[PDB]
Amino acid sequence: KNYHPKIRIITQMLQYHNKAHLLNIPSWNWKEGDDAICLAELKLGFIAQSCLAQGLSTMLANLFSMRSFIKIEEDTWQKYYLEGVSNEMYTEYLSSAFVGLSFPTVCELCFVKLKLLMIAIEYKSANRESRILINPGNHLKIQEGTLGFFIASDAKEVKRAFFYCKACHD
Amino acid sequence: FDDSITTGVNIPIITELVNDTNVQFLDQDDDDDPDTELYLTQPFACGTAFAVSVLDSLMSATYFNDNILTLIRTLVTGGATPELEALIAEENALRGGYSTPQTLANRDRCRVAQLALLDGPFADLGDGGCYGDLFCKALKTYNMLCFGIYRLRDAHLSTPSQCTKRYVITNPPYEFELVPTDLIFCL
Amino acid sequence: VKKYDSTGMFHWCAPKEIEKVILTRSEAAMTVLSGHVVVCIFGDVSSALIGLRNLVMPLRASNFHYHELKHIVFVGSIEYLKREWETLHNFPKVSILPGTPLSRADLRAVNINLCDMCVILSANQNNIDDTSLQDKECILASLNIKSMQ
């Protein structure tokens, strides 16, 4: 960051207590892409979620890997599994048609119509303080400019949320 | 164990592994030569063996989409706002407050748990109903996302046994007939 | 009674045993420290002595008055400073705070915003692994203090 203080960097850490030192560098802006990956926070977090619902250590660890979609035919516990190993988290901006709708109406309109599962939104409370909200209830409505966190098998199908309107796509 | 094995093998455990070839040794039902890679094995597919090396693919996935490491950080640490991560960085461990009614709005964002299709108002759909009916009615009535089934290994009629090993399937379609032995990943 | 170290060239006191000068994070908060010196020692029980006799002694010269002498606070491991204290115990106005000089709790407990100098010393093993990766604990401590508010 001395040599070029605009570059995006991505760092693996080994402890959690000393990824606070990366805040002290003045060029380090995590809002621009400088995200450090802690390994003792995510390993002991995926295990701590499996104490709540067993399987989330491999529910999540298949959602960020480009898995080789081979097709098994005769087997039964591996055929149902490998159809669920090609699903990945993609982001796409919501279209203008969703504005004003509540969150549970949107996920219904994404899964019934688009055949996309939508897990979370990015609520613009502030442009410098934008929280990320997994599955809110009826308290929220979709703003123009909330980012849609999807789960899909293809990068093509996730673009169809930006093209949802009540004229021809519906 | 006493009856007053109870589960014995069916105690649910999870194991971190330093290596990845050692995933063969956790179960006695494996068919795994030492090049069947780590996502295909049974102890990883059932969710009982979390090696660290499946997080080496995360920084390739973080580079292509920036909001990918921030979606699994929250979901997983629970809280972990940077306003809270700074306060842990300041002096010590956590510090207590006196529960003002806006910090009590920080509660009840999302619980993460799984529940069964053996009782409740879902068993009428959880015996023969399509999964796409189950997902729509949970948001419509109870407002929770059904994002995965924790399928038992021998739900297919394969000489019914006491194998309680359940594997994980992620986001099944509007189709995909249920079995009453299933468990549902909800929020 | 009289403490001016018979040469007549530095300052002197009674030989303090080490427990009298130890502070904690709550004790040094009540101690008003201003215009003082915070020395950050990165040490170990096994690392070599840097000889803090040579640091305190020019700051205890007889050329200054006892109401002027700057209070010295060492921030480091006590397992290092148990070794050092035999060479320091006749000097006035010296406190030791246990704790690493990377926790900001220990740097706020000594009120580092009011100090006259924050000396950061690498008392550790030197030439451990590389050339440039030697003083990495001294760079992170200086980046730590320049980022506090």
Q: DSSP per residue over A121-159, as a string?
A: EEE-S-SSS-EEEES--SS-B--TTPEEEEEES-TTGGG
Determine contact, residues A89/A149, Cβ cutoff 8 Å.
yes
Comparing alpha-carbon positions, the chain A residue that sits nearest to B41 is A78
Method underlying the structure: cryo-EM
Residue B85's φ and ψ, nearest 5 degrees, are -65, -25
B99-115 in b/e form (b: 16+ CB < 10 A) is eeeeeeeeeebbebebe
At residue A76, what are phi and psi to the nearest 5 degrees? -120, -35
Chain C contact for A15, CB < 8 A?
no
| Secondary structure (DSSP) of B82-129 | HHHHHHHHHTSS-------TTGGGSS-S---EEEESSSGGGTTTTTT-
* A26 Cβ neighbours under 8 A, 6+ residues apart: C147
> Using CB atoms, which chains have 3+ pairs under 8 A with A?
B, C
* DSSP class of C49: P
- Would an 8 Å CB–CB cutoff place B86 in contact with chain C? no
C: neighbours with 3+ CB pairs under 8 Å? A, B
Nearest by CB: B55 against A39, A48, A62: A39
For residue B184 the two structure tokens come to 């549902």
Q: Are strands B113-116 and B183-186 parallel, antiparallel or unpaired?
A: antiparallel
| B92 interfacial to chain C (CB closer than 8 Å) | yes
Q: Is the Cβ pair A21, C146 closer than 8 Å?
A: no
CA–CA separation, A168 and B58 (whole Å) = 38
Alpha-carbon gap, residue C2 to C138, rounded angstroms: 40
Instruction: Work out the burial of residue C38: count CB atoms within 10 Å of its CB; fewer than 13 is exposed, 13-18 middle, 19 or more buried.
Output: buried
**Shortest distance, CA C127 to any CA of chain A (angstroms):** 23
Centroid of chain to Cα C110: 11
How far, in Å, CA of C60 to CA of C70, rounded? Answer: 8
Give B169's contacts (C-beta < 8 A, 6+ positions apart). A80, A81, A83, A84, B148, B149, B151
Instruction: State the Cα–Cα distance between residues C133 and C122, nearest whole angstrom.
Output: 12
Residue list for the binding site of B:
24, 27, 30, 32
What is the distance between the alpha carbons of residues C103 and A21, in angstroms, rounded to a whole number?
11
C84-143 residues touching A, CB cutoff 8 A: 140, 143
Q: Quote the Cα angle for B170-B175-B177, to 5°.
A: 85
Does A132 contact B76 at a Cβ distance shorter than 8 Å? no
CA distance B134 to B121: 10
Contact call for C146 and A24, based on CB within 8 A: yes
Cβ of C108 and B89 within 8 Å?
no
Binding-site members of B for Ca(2+) are 24, 27, 30, 32
Interface membership of C128 toward B (CB under 8 Å):
no
Name the minimum distance, in Å, from the CA of A49 to any CA of chain B: 7
Give the list of residues 6+ apart from residue A125 with CB closer than 8 angstroms, or none.
Answer: A131
Provide CB contacts within 8 A for A40, sequence distance 6+. A13, A14, A15, A16
CA-closest candidate to residue A137, choices A111, A104, A106: A104
Chain C: residue whose CA lies nearest to A26: C147
Q: CB of A77 within 8 A of CB of B157? A: no
Strands (DSSP E) found in C16-71: 37-42
Q: How far apart are CA B158 and CA B43, in angstroms?
A: 20
A134–B110 CB contact, under 8 Å: yes
Kindly determine whether residue B39 and residue A65, on different chains, have CB atoms separated by under 8 Å: yes
Select the residue from B30, B32, B57, B75 to test the A interface by mutation, using most A Cβ atoms within 10 A.
B75
Contact list, A137 vs chain B (CB under 8 Å): 143
**Can you say whether residue B152 is alpha, beta or left, with left for phi > 0 and alpha for psi between -120 and 50 degrees?**
beta
Resolution as reported, in Å: 3.5
Which subunits count as partners of chain B given 3+ CB pairs below 8 Å?
A: A, C
